[PDB]
Every structure is written in C-alpha cells, then in structure tokens.
From a paper:
Here we report the biochemical and structural characterization of this M-ADH enzyme, which we refer to as BkTauF. We demonstrate that it is a novel sulfoacetaldehyde reductase, which differs from BwSarD in active site residues and metabolic function. BkTauF catalyzed both sulfoacetaldehyde reduction and isethionate oxidation, as measured using a continuous spectrophotometric assay monitoring the decrease/increase in absorbance at 340 nm due to consumption/production of NAD(P)H. The optimal reaction pH for sulfoacetaldehyde reduction was 7.5, while that for isethionate oxidation was 10.0. Each monomer consists of an N-terminal domain (α1–α5 and β1–β9; residues 1–178) with Rossmann fold, and a C-terminal helical domain (α6-α14; residues 179–375), similar to other structurally characterized M-ADH enzymes.
Crystal structures of BkTauF, both in the apo form and in complex with the NAD+ cofactor, were solved at 1.9 and 3.0 Å resolution, respectively. The apo and NAD+-bound structures are nearly identical, with RMSD of 0.37 Å over 375 Cα atoms. The cleft between N-terminal domain and C-terminal domain accommodates the protein active site containing NAD+ and the catalytic divalent metal ion. The electron density is well defined for NAD+, which is bound in a configuration similar to that in other M-ADH enzymes. Out of the four monomers in the asymmetric unit, only one contains the catalytic Zn(II) ion, coordinated to Asp192, Gln196, His261 and His275. Although both NADH and NADPH could serve as substrates, the KM for NADH was ten-fold lower than that of NADPH, suggesting a preference for NADH as the reductant. The position of isethionate is constrained by the requirements of the M-ADH catalytic mechanism, which requires coordination of the hydroxyl O-atom to Zn2+, and hydride transfer from C1 of isethionate to C4 of the NAD+. We identified Phe252, Thr257 and Phe265 surrounding the active-site cavity as potential substrate-interacting residues. Activities were almost completely abolished in the T257A and F265A mutants, while the F252A mutant retained approximately 28% of the WT activity. Determination of the crystal structure of BkTauF in complex with NAD+, together with mutagenesis of active site residues, enabled us to better understand the structural requirements for substrate binding and catalysis.
Author numbering:
A (entry chain B), B (entry chain A): 0 to 375
C-alpha cells in the first residue's frame, strides 16, 4: 500500500514577457494599492519601475530594505509599510530572499504581533494573509510554489523556517527574462539548488509519484542547460529551460521535503558563508553513491530515466557539473579544525537528515566532512 | 518560447482504505449533513452506508436517480433534493457520471434556474457552490481533478459539456478498494481511457511540461498493470497502480485537452454504442503511426522514455494490449455502409481534432474509417 497527499494551489503563468500581466491579476482579483518587495538591484536598474508603470496604478509602494539572509526585523519593517499605505496585495519580485519576507509580512501585517512570536516557537501562524504574486528572478529555489519562509533572528541568533498554509502564493509568474541579469556565479549556485531539490525530493522517504515525474523532468534539464546558462548568460533558451526546471523542481520538494544535502547545507551556509545551492551540491553526489541501492533499486531507475547507465555514472556527472561551472568540490581552503568538523556533524543532525533512504550515522558524517575538509 | 498556464486546485488524498476519511474532511471544514450522490449499485452492496456510518452523522441523504449518460433533469432532481434537506456539501462516490451531476447540482442548487439554462448555450455558471468531495470508483476518467461536467439534454437531443471553475472538487479521495468491484470488461474500457488521455494529452498542441511529465508516468503504468487488473480483478497492487495512473493522467489532459482519438470516439459511442474508453483506444494506435515523426521527434522521445525503441514499437504494444484485455481492433462486425462511414467522417471533425500535431484531413478520416471497417 502507498499513501500520499498532494496539494498545489499556486497558479503558474510561464512565458517570456509575461511579467507585464500583473495588471491582469489585480483587475481580476479586484485588488488595488500593492507593495512590491524587490531587492534594490531592480530599483536602480529601472526594471522595478517598468512593471509598476505597466500595472497602471495597481502597485503604489515599494519595499527594498531586506538582506539576502532575511531577518525577522525586515519582515516587521515590511509589515509596517503595508500597515501605513493600506496595501491589499503583495508582489514578490526577487530570488528566494525577497519571496521569503513577502510570505511572512503578508500574514503578519494583519496582526499587531511581531513575526518573532511564531519563529520556531510552536505558535501557529494565522492563516489570514494578503494575496501574494511571486515573480522569481533566480532559477532558482522554487520558493514561488512553497509554503515555507526561511527567516533569521540576529538579536537572538535563531535561524529556522516557518511553514504555514497562508504562505502559498496565489499566482506565480515565471518570466525567464528576469533571470537574464543573474551573474554566472549565482546562476551556477541557483542551478545546483534546482538539481538538489529534484534528486533529494525523489529518494526521500516521503516520496510520491506526482512529485517524481516533476523531479525526473527537472533533473534532466539541469544536466543539459545549466552549463550553457553559466557560460552564456544571454542565452534565451538556456535561461528559459532553467526556469522550467526551477518551478517544476519546486513542486517536488513542497510535500516530500528534502533530505541529507539540505540538512548539511545549513551549517555550511550559516557558519562558513557558503551559498545555499553550493552547500547542497557539496554533498549531493556523496549521498548519491550511498543511497544508490536503497528502496529496491528505485534510485537506479531514476538515473536510467534521465539518461545514465547507473547511479555512480550519475554521481560522476554531478561532480563534472560542479567543476565545469565552478562550484565547490571540497573544503580544504577553510583549514577546518577537528572542533569545526565536529561542529559540522552535530549541527547536521537536522530533522531533514532522517528523510534519507539510508540511515546516516554520525560516523558517516565524520567520514564525509573529513573527506570534504581534505579536498580542493 | 514556451507559454503555458497551470492551475490544479484539487487536493488529492490517495490511499487504500482512506474512503473512511470523509469525517475528517467534513470536520476540518466544520461541515455536517451531506448528500452522497452515488449509483444504486453501491447502495445495494452496503458500501454507501459503510461510509455514512463512518462519517458519523456528517452525511445524511443519498441520491441514486441518474443514468450512465446523465440528463439535466436528474441534476435538477438532485438539486431540488438539496434544497429540501439543506445539505452543506456534496459527496460524489461513483464513476464519471456520478461526478458530473455532483458538479452541476452543487452550483445550481444555490440558484433557482434550471441547469439546462447553461447547457451549451454559453451562459457562464455561478461561481458559488457547495463543497465537493469526489470519491471516484473507476480508473478511470479523472473527473475528480477536472472542472468539466459532461451532461445530456434528452428532450433537446443534445449532449454538451459544461466547464466552470466552480466545478473543481475540494478534495478528491482516491481509494483502490472501491475499484475491486469493477467487472473486467469495464476495467479494460476505463483502462484504455487513461492511456488515451495520457498519449493524446502529451502530443497535443496545447502541451506543457508539467502535464507531459504526468502523461509519461501514467502511460508507463497502464502497459504493465492493466492486463493484471483485467485477468485478476482483486489484485490489490494492479488496482492501486491503475488508480495512481488514472488520477495522474487526469492532470495530464485537463489543460492540454484531448486530440483525435477523443474526437473520433464521440460518434463511435453515441451512434454505435461503443464505450468511451474502447472507442478512444480503437483509433489510438492508428494516430500514433501518423504522429510518430511529428513535433520534431517529440513523440519518439516519449516512446523511448516509457521503454520502447520507437513509436512503432509502442503502437504494437497498444495493439497487443487491446487483444489481451478484449478491446475492439476493428469495425468489420458492424457491416457499415458507405453512408455510415461517411457519417463518421462528418461527425469526427470535432474541435478536439485540430489539437493533433499532424493535420487530420477528411481524406485521412475516410481512409482510416474504411480501414477499420475491414478489420476484425
Ligand atoms: N523559501 C523557500 O522555500 C526556500 C527554499 C530554499 C532556499 N531558500 C532561501 O532563499 C535564499 C536563496 O534565494 P536565491 O537562491 O534566489 O539567492 P537570493 O535571491 O538569496 O540572493 C541572490 C542575490 O542575487 C542578487 N541579484 C543580482 N542580480 C539579480 C537578478 N537579475 N535576479 C535575481 N537576483 C539578482 C540579489 O540581489 C541577491 O542578493 C537563501 O537564503 C535560501 O536559504 C528559501
Ligand atoms: N468530466 C470529465 O473530466 C470526464 C472525462 C472523461 C469522461 N467523462 C464522462 O464520464 C462518463 C464516463 O465515466 P466512466 O467511464 O466511469 O463511465 P460510467 O460513468 O458509466 O461508469 C459508471 C458505471 O460503471 C458501472 N459499474 C459496475 N461496477 C462498478 C463499480 N464497482 N464502480 C463503479 N462503476 C461500476 C455502473 O454501471 C456505473 O454506472 C462518461 O459520461 C464520459 O463522457 C467525464
């Protein structure tokens, strides 16, 4: 017997030049006076003002004060702006960081309580929220189809996600044109994040068939088009394909969740400043050679479906992919101490690690990090 | 570039024995007193009361007065029942016929007009309705994840579908136990209906990547388990695997729509009484040999993705599948006249026919129908 649930209530509009259709959603939903949460890059580049003028007065205010690693203070700061201008909907035009505070601010601006009162403290988020129109500009994190908002508390040293049914965006416009301006180094990291969510989402203990079809489709696209997009940022086909894999791979991690590589990326990112997708890719092919034979050859069928002889052949491609696009293949330059390696193992015992098809023991993490700390 | 919209607002609770969870959905929504629209077979078998008592007062009334091809009068008869008993939600436990009157009667009971006032005339349905909990009992048509309600106007001699966003069921519980009681002949016909909507849904003109990932997963499951479900009606795994492919193929054809085998199946059913799934599969392999080199080798990559050397190897698998499960391979026993063959050509020119990649001219229809008239 196989039991599973599937819920995906985010409408998706895909196509180049469809970011101008924000006026079509604010008129159909009957919503005026919107706030666009976008990084300051799009403000100085005129791309933000181009869509606001196209919306024809639908969007009024703009909020750009937030970090790539967003804090709980920028969420309440964005919530205060919504409370003042009486904003009805929230536009999230950015990467995984601009869309993280948009989900949190749209639900918290309807209460007089801080966003910290629900940040990993057991308190459930109020489901009442403003509508969200996610416009991802990186390909990506797939956050435009998830109910997750990853935040940080600098004054309290806390960093934990918040999962609420009210964080689901109503509409998510995936425009590949907004990804043209992504630098090659970020394109490679965000591309590895798509590949990690696709592979981890498949071999997860909470897998389901609808997510597997999306996971296999997105993974094959990353192996083919991601090197092209890194080398050629203006390649319209390679960018559009990466957006295709990005939103589709997001549909494979919302329910089955992620496993080992995402559990190890949290210490590799927060402690050592390694970007998220690059930290996940740092251990992707490592756990692949471990889970290759689990689930009665199910992972072997995944590799053959995307065009590989075995899983070890697929793990070789993941390694050749990271080298060609300039991603980390080791941690020898960090000069990690035995205390730091032991810190990597203790913090890697995350709830996501238990979703791995093969039980990862502490002796395995100690072997992996000692191998990573001794590799260029 | 690629342009496509994706909207799947149905919640899928898949699992063996999860039909008892009507109480959970009614309690979570805080709803009581529901009307269960089901065929009379499930009442005579006690399966309807097993779920009424499992809901523990959540479901109160039962409606069983509708034909396999549902008439508008049977909808208003069910609508007036909800008006006289004020039910709060609709339970659709049955085939496509039961899930097509549950969509119309849930929206028309809130009004005072007849459901025929929106049947083919073009008048939009009111977007206010009662919640729908779809419990499909075949595998299938996927009506639990679509917004179309195929009806029939017997007094007016018309059979036209109705498409309304308010017809989307809230939750679609897919339980393979409800399919154990399907006779092998109906299993084979409904089984071919899944493979049709998957193959047609893939090579359609309005194809999109999310639906194509689902189309390949569903098609690969039918080739392996459909003969098992036919020769072994109580095979639990074969039944579950057919239920899995049926709901996944529902998401595959709801947006890209159907192509030629569905356009040719409508005259094969209303005039000659051939079941829908059997009438679709009667021409499915014929159009495959036409669309093999279409869309720049796209259908070729589809056949290799599911495990065939080419479409020709897949077309042979379709033929051998129908012979093993006892589906029509020709129309020689009908002894069709030259008038009848030309009558099938006229009616087969349906709007869904133009969705085929290769153009289906009237001469190709005349050639195909004359070929089937000479085939056993
Ligand atoms: N919410 C979720 O479900 C989810 C899932 C995974 C990761 N995340 C979090 O999301 C963040 C990652 O998001 P990311 O992977 O998009 O990077 P990002 O958006 O965090 O930061 C990327 C940087 O690129 C800059 N940039 C320059 N030109 C750009 C352009 N043309 N388009 C977009 N950005 C441009 C942005 O200003 C930003 O500083 C991490 O903090 C990660 O933890 C969230
Ligand atoms: N709305 C949609 O998305 C969609 C898609 C395809 C077809 N359809 C329509 O739906 C109908 C076809 O649905 P179907 O293929 O289920 O045909 P159908 O609805 O006739 O199947 C129901 C019949 O199956 C028989 N049956 C015997 N044992 C059964 C059992 N144990 N469980 C269920 N039924 C049993 C009964 O006679 C019952 O009337 C047609 O009217 C077709 O046009 C709708």
């Amino acid at each position: 017997g196989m039991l599973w649930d599937y819920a995906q209530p985010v409408t998706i509009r895909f196509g180049k030049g469809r970011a101008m259709e924000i006026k079509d959603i604010a008129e159909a939903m009957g919503l005026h006076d919107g706030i666009m949460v976008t990084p300051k890059f799009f403000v100085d580049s005129g791309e933000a003002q181009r869509l606001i003028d196209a919306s024809d007065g639908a969007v009024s205010t703009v909020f750009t004060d937030f970090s790539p690693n967003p804090d709980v203070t920028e969420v309440d700061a964005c919530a205060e702006i919504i409370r003042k201008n009486h904003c009805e909907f929230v536009v999230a035009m950015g990467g995984g960081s601009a869309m993280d505070v948009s989900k949190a601010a749209a639900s918290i601006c309807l209460t007089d309580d801080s966003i910290a009162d629900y940040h990993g403290t057991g308190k459930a988020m109020p489901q009442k929220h403003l509508p969200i129109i996610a416009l991802p500009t990186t390909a990506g994190t797939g956050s435009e189809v998830t109910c997750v908002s990853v935040l940080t508390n600098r004054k309290l040293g806390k960093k934990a996600p918040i999962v609420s049914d009210g964080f689901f965006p109503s509409v998510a416009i995936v425009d590949p044109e907004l990804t043209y301006s992504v630098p090659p180094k970020i394109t490679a990291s965000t591309g590895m994040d798509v590949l990690s969510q696709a592979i981890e989402g498949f071999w997860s203990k909470g897998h389901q068939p609808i997510c597997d079809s999306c996971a296999a489709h997105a993974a094959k696209l990353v192996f083919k088009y991601l090197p092209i997009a890194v080398a050629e940022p203006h390649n319209e086909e390679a960018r559009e394909k990466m957006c295709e894999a990005s939103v589709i791979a997001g549909l494979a991690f919302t329910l089955p969740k992620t496993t080992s590589s995402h559990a190890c990326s949290f210490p590799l990112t927060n402690i050592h400043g390694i970007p998220h997708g690059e930290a996940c890719g740092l251990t992707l092919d490592y756990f692949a050679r471990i889970n290759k034979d689990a689930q009665h050859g199910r992972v072997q069928e995944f590799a053959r479906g995307i065009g590989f002889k075995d899983v070890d052949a697929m793990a070789d491609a993941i390694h050749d992919l990271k080298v060609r696009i300039g991603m980390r293949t080791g941690l020898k330059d960090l000069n990690l101490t035995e205390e730091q390696i032991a810190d990597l193992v203790r913090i890697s015992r995350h709830p996501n690690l238990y979703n791995n098809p093969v039980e990862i023991t502490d002796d395995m993490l100690d072997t992996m990090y000692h191998y990573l700390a001794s590799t260029d």
